[PDB]
Each structure stands twice: as structure tokens, then as C-alpha cells.
């Protein structure tokens, strides 16, 4: 036991030295001649009404027109954002729903929560009705996130310190990813869809290879729980939001932290993170009831989106890059442009 | 046009359904049940009831005087609680059960209550405090095998208040113990001195019948305080 612990300490020291032998320059030094983006101002176009209680998640479709939302009163609504017409309103079986997703082919949606179950809903039915088609069971803790890869494979993460890859047609887990110590809070998929990353409420993040099922790299640097994570557009970086009031930019090839976004005034944690189409803006949602817009290459705040009444819990940006949707605990969605 | 009319008709049907659903959602009362394994909260659930493997939550429904209560219990989770406890920031009340006749794990209950009271997202929610298993407490005090002062030294000099009105038939030692234990919790309750939310304590046994009425009355008082605060009168 003691020898194994000593070997672990030696390996950690060697890894630390290998990382420290590479920081020949900082991101600020390389980017000291970049012209700032100036002030950014955005206005609400549409306000979408109809939920009865607070909202936990949303997701944009691939057509950049239809979106899905999930509220804690037990409903899942599909909206058209150009005319604010409700296309669908599906009632759930368990009302403590925490996540939602939208299939890239536009045929299915999914949801889950404290019931330890992932439910799949089929939209394109000849009878014109939405009905449950699959319930995936086998996790021993609440569900945090889920993301389709295609019409047949789905990857989820639970509050039992595990992630899993499921075959919907058969109904059995095909691989399980283990190694985290705390509850897994968020995951994000790569553009090529052959890797993902995960942040899991113990102040660490991991990079997972889908096919093989093992862990490639582990990233540390925060000092409390991690709440959100997402990929940079080219698939070679990712941003992390935490509960110590700090966002951080991490790289995969240099194997260490690149940048910290924080201010001496903020004393509240970040609940959502998302990028922009060219990656020049990083948008964040806070417990202060308002969202912040940061320049991602010079670490200077550049805008505020400040129209909500309660905690902001979800944030999304379309695939063409025209609008930004925010959802909060007062049961209202808003679209900015 | 010729297609948009159907879309608006669809949206109108959906809105009608949503209104009919809001009508019934705004009328039920939601309660969250909390406790430990050595308590008897399952007995409370069973007493109020007649009135899938790996399941993460259970629901129990009842009604009193044509008012409908939904009580939620947590099933198969892990030890930690600082993440799924935030989903319950809008319930009417939290029902907290404590086993009061062990003397060894009572500090754990105090610490749990003190951590719930001060959480940022649970500062408006009231608590109904049940102190279960009182006959065992009476027998244990009358036996004399274990002494309370071995865990709370300040019990060595606590005198029952003169203005207190005891229940008939009590041996004064039992009343001393009961009053001391209840005071240990009300002291944490009022140390904030805010007025947003209140703690209502009771003493209950293993065979009992009036617990549903107690919950009903305390919920009535809670609703009254909300109604006063809503009209800007306070």
C-alpha cells in the first residue's frame, strides 16, 4: 500500500514536471496585438410563454428553427421559434426531469432525471401521436446528461460516477466508462463524434475514447465542482465552468490549462457555458440572474444579457449562428439577436 | 396561406389543453419526506397510506377534507445530497423525522437540521419536525441504565420551566428529558430570527392516528402566512 502510494506520488511529480517544461509563453503574450471586439449589445426578439414551473434544459435542432424544452411540472414542449407556435406538448411519467436532447435526424427526442431511466420518444408516427418507444434502465443514480450520436446509439452520464453507451434497438449497454470519483455533471461530444469529454463534480475533467472505452487524459486545475463543459469549434480545446466563480480554457495537445476568465466582483457560480460560431465569443450563465459575454482570446468581458428574473439555468446557440436562447427558473425562454 | 390556419388551430388546441392542466396543477400540495434509516418514516407512510428494481423516487397520495397531498420519498441514491436537494425548492413543506431514544446519533440529526435550515435555496421552506419513538425514550429514562449527561453535559443543570404545563400522568424525569430534547432543536430554529419560515415540533409514537391532521393544520398556517405576505400587508 505504502509503496503503491509512493509510486503514485512519483508519477504525479513526473507528470507535473513534464507539463511545466512546456510553458515557454502565455496566451496573453501571443495575443497582445489582437484588436478588441468592443461593446456587444443584443435585444430580445421573441419571448416564449407557456410552462407552469421552472425550466431545466433546452436543445436546438439542426434546421435552426425548432427547439425543445423541459420543465419541472412534467412537460416537454417543442416550439417553432419563427412564429412562436407550439408544434408539440408531450406529458411525462415522472415530473422530476433534469435533461433533454434532440436527435440529429429530427425523428426522436429523449429525456431523463431522478427516476434513473432514459426515455425515448418517436415523433414521426403514422397515427400522428407521440408515444414512448424505449425505456433504458440500469443506472443506479440520477441522470445528468444525454446526447445522440445517430438514430441507434446514445451516450449518457449518471450521478453514480459512471458514463455509458447504449444500443437503443437491442436495449443493453455496450460499454461503461468508469474512473470518476464524484457525480458526473456534464459531457460534450466532438465534431467528428469519436471522442467526448466529461466534468464530474470532483474538480477534474476527462477525455474518453468512445470505441475502446478507456481514459486518455485527465485535466485538473479548478477547486470545486464542475457544472458545464463544451468543445471549441475545431475540436482541439474546451471550456469549463465551475462553482468557484471561474471559467477556464483547456487544451488537448499542450496538456495543460491555457486561460482563466474571472473577476474580483463575481462571488457566484457558473451554471452554463457555450461558444460562438467562430469561437471569438464565450457566453456564460450565472446565478446572479444575468448572462455574460467574454472575449475568448483576450479575457476581457464585452457584454451582458440581463433580462431575467430568477436563476439562469440553460443557454444555447444555433448551428448557423443567428440567435441565442436562454432559459431560467421563472418559466420563460428568451431569444436574443 | 391555406396552411397557416391549420398551424394556428393546432396551437390553439395545445393552449386549451395547457389551461385545463394548469387548473389542476395549481390546486394540490406537495410535501418532501426526510429522515434516516433508524427512524420510522416508513411507518408514517404506511399509517397515512390507508387513509421496479432500482427506482429512484416514490410517491404517496392522500387527501384530507377535500385537499390533496402528494408526498415524495427518495429511494435508491448515494450518500451525497448537495445536488438533488435543489430540485425541491418550491415544495410547501419538509417533513423531518428523528429517532429520539438513542442518545448516540442525535447530534447527527442536529447537524443535518442545521445544514438544511441555512441552505441558500431552502430559506423560504418550512419544516414540520416529528420526534418518533417516544415510548422507548420513556422506558429508557425510567430504567436508569444510561445517562443523558454523558452526551449533553448541560442537561446536568436544566430545570423544567415553572410556567410549563405538563401532560397528565407524566413522571417529571420524562418531562425534563422531552422538554430538553425539543429545546435543543427550537434553539437552532430561532437563532436566525428572520420570520420567513418556521418549525413546528411534535411528539409521536409508533401507533398513532392524528398525524395527517397535524400536517393539514400546519399547512394551513403556512398558506396563511404566504397570503399575508402576498398582499403586501407584511
Amino acid at each position, epitope marked *: 500500500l505504502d509503496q503503491l502510494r509512493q509510486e503514485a506520488e512519483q508519477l504525479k511529480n513526473q507528470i507535473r514536471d513534464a507539463r511545466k517544461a512546456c510553458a515557454d509563453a502565455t496566451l496573453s503574450q501571443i495575443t497582445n496585438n489582437i484588436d478588441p471586439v468592443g461593446r456587444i449589445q443584443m435585444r430580445t426578439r421573441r419571448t416564449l410563454r407557456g410552462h407552469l414551473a421552472k425550466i431545466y434544459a433546452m436543445h436546438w435542432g439542426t434546421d435552426s428553427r425548432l427547439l425543445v424544452s423541459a420543465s419541472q411540472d412534467g412537460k416537454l414542449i417543442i416550439w417553432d421559434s419563427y412564429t412562436t407556435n407550439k408544434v408539440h406538448a408531450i406529458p411525462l411519467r415522472s415530473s422530476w426531469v433534469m435533461t433533454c436532447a434532440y436527435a440529429p435526424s429530427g425523428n426522436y427526442v429523449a429525456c431523463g432525471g431522478l427516476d434513473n431511466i432514459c426515455s425515448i420518444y418517436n415523433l414521426k408516427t403514422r397515427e400522428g401521436n407521440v408515444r414512448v418507444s424505449r425505456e433504458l434502465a440500469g443506472h443506479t443514480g440520477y441522470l445528468s446528461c444525454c446526447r445522440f450520436l445517430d438514430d441507434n446509439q446514445i451516450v449518457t452520464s449518471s450521478g453514480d460516477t459512471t458514463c455509458a453507451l447504449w444500443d437503443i434497438e437491442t436495449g443493453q449497454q455496450t460499454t461503461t466508462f468508469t474512473g470518476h470519483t464524484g457525480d458526473v455533471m456534464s459531457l460534450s461530444l466532438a465534431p467528428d463524434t469519436r471522442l467526448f469529454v466529461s466534468g464530474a463534480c470532483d474538480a477534474s475533467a476527462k477525455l474518453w475514447d468512445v470505441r475502446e472505452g478507456m481514459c486518455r487524459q485527465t485535466f485538473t486545475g479548478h477547486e470545486s465542482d464542475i457544472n458545464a463543459i463544451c468543445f471549441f469549434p475545431n475540436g482541439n480545446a474546451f471550456a469549463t465552468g465551475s462553482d468557484d466563480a471561474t471559467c477556464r480554457l483547456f487544451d488537448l495537445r499542450a496538456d495543460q490549462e491555457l486561460m482563466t476568465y474571472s473577476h474580483d466582483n463575481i462571488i457566484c457560480g457558473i451554471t452554463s457555458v457555450s461558444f460562438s460560431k467562430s469561437g471569438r465569443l464565450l457566453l456564460a450563465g450565472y446565478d446572479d440572474f444575468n448572462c455574460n459575454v467574454w472575449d475568448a482570446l483576450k479575457a476581457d468581458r464585452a457584454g451582458v444579457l440581463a433580462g431575467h428574473d430568477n436563476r439562469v439555468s440553460c443557454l444555447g446557440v444555433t448551428d448557423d449562428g443567428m440567435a441565442v436562447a436562454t432559459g431560467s427558473w421563472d418559466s420563460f425562454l428568451k431569444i436574443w439577436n | 396561406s391555406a396552411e397557416d390556419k391549420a398551424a394556428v388551430e393546432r396551437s390553439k388546441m395545445i393552449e386549451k389543453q395547457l389551461q385545463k392542466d394548469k387548473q389542476v396543477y395549481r390546486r394540490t400540495l406537495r410535501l418532501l419526506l426526510l429522515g434516516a434509516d433508524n427512524s420510522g418514516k416508513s411507518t408514517i407512510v404506511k399509517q397515512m397510506r390507508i387513509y421496479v428494481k432500482t427506482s429512484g423516487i416514490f410517491e404517496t397520495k392522500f387527501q384530507v377534507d377535500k385537499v390533496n397531498f402528494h408526498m415524495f420519498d427518495v429511494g435508491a441514491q448515494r*450518500d451525497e445530497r448537495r445536488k438533488w436537494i435543489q430540485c425541491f425548492n418550491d415544495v410547501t413543506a419538509i417533513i423531518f423525522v428523528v429517532d429520539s431514544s438513542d442518545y448516540n446519533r442525535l447530534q447527527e440529526a442536529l447537524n443535518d437540521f442545521k445544514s438544511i435550515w441555512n441552505n441558500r435555496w431552502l430559506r423560504t421552506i418550512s419544516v414540520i419536525l416529528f420526534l418518533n419513538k417516544q415510548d422507548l425514550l420513556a422506558e429508557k429514562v425510567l430504567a436508569g441504565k444510561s445517562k443523558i449527561e454523558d452526551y449533553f453535559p448541560e442537561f446536568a443543570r436544566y430545570t423544567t420551566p415553572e410556567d410549563a404545563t405538563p401532560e397528565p400522568g407524566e413522571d417529571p424525569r420524562v418531562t425534563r428529558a422531552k422538554y430538553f430534547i425539543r429545546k435543543e432543536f427550537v434553539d437552532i430554529s430561532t437563532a436566525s430570527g428572520d420570520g420567513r419560515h418556521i418549525c413546528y415540533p411534535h411528539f409521536t409514537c409508533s401507533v398513532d392516528t392524528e398525524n395527517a391532521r397535524r400536517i393539514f393544520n400546519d399547512c394551513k398556517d403556512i398558506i396563511l402566512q404566504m397570503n399575508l405576505r402576498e398582499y403586501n400587508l407584511v
Partner: nanobody
Framework: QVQLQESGGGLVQPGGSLRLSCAAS????????MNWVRQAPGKGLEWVSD????????SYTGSVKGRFTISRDNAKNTLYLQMNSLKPEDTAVYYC?????????????????????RGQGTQVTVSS
């Protein structure tokens, strides 16, 4: 990389005294509330004492009142416990614990399921 390392402990004859010192790294020491917990042979984890962000609020359990004291050096990043007049039932393993979040006045840090921000403990034995 949060790290909490303990030092002190050992064998003590009954009625003795000693000192436990814990050193912390990987976070801003002054924003967090701190605790001392212990595990006794053949039992679960137990809470012993706690101190707040400055030292103006201290709390103990009923079994160690008048015997153990706690202290906090924010400049030297260190948490101290002083033990006087030990008993044979004070033999256990001792861990120092940190709150999950800053600027907050509550805790959820007694669990067994590998609480993340906790140390490896030291052994304190009292017998002769």
C-alpha cells in the same frame, strides 16, 4: 489540485496531551470553513469540531467540551487542534475536512462515499 496533509498523533498515556497540525494547498485558504472529524475502530465517521472563515465562531461536540481547542492560521495556511487530558476512548483516526463551496455557512461532508476534499488521517492511540 486540492491537497490536505496531516501531521501529529501517536501513542499517549492516559491523561496526556498533544497537537494535530494540518497543511492545505490548492485553494485560497481564507474563503472556506473548516472541520475536524474522526473514525473510531469498528464504527462510522463522526464529527468533532468546526471553525469558520475568520475564527469568530467555534463549535464542539458534547464529548470534547473543555478538553480540545481549535485554531486557524490564514497566513501559514494551517489548521491546529490541541488535545489535553486524553481518554482511552479517544483512540481513532483523525481527518481534516473542507466545505464544498466558498462564502457559505453549511456542510455536507461526513459521508463515506469518498468525499473528495478530505485527508488521509492520522492514528491517535491512548492506552498503557
Amino acid at each position: 489540485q486540492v491537497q490536505l496533509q496531516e501531521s501529529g498523533g501517536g501513542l499517549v498515556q492516559p491523561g496526556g496531551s498533544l497537537r494535530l497540525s494540518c497543511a492545505a494547498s490548492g485553494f485560497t485558504f481564507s474563503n472556506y470553513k473548516m472541520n475536524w472529524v474522526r473514525q473510531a475502530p469498528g464504527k462510522g465517521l463522526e464529527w468533532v469540531s468546526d471553525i469558520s472563515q475568520s475564527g469568530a465562531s467555534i463549535s464542539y461536540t458534547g464529548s470534547v467540551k473543555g478538553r480540545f481547542t481549535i485554531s486557524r492560521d490564514n497566513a501559514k495556511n494551517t489548521l491546529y487542534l490541541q488535545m489535553n487530558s486524553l481518554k482511552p476512548e479517544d483512540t481513532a483516526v483523525y481527518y481534516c475536512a473542507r466545505c464544498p463551496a466558498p462564502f457559505t455557512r453549511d456542510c455536507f461532508d461526513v459521508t463515506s462515499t469518498t468525499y473528495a476534499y478530505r485527508g488521509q488521517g492520522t492514528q491517535v492511540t491512548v492506552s498503557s
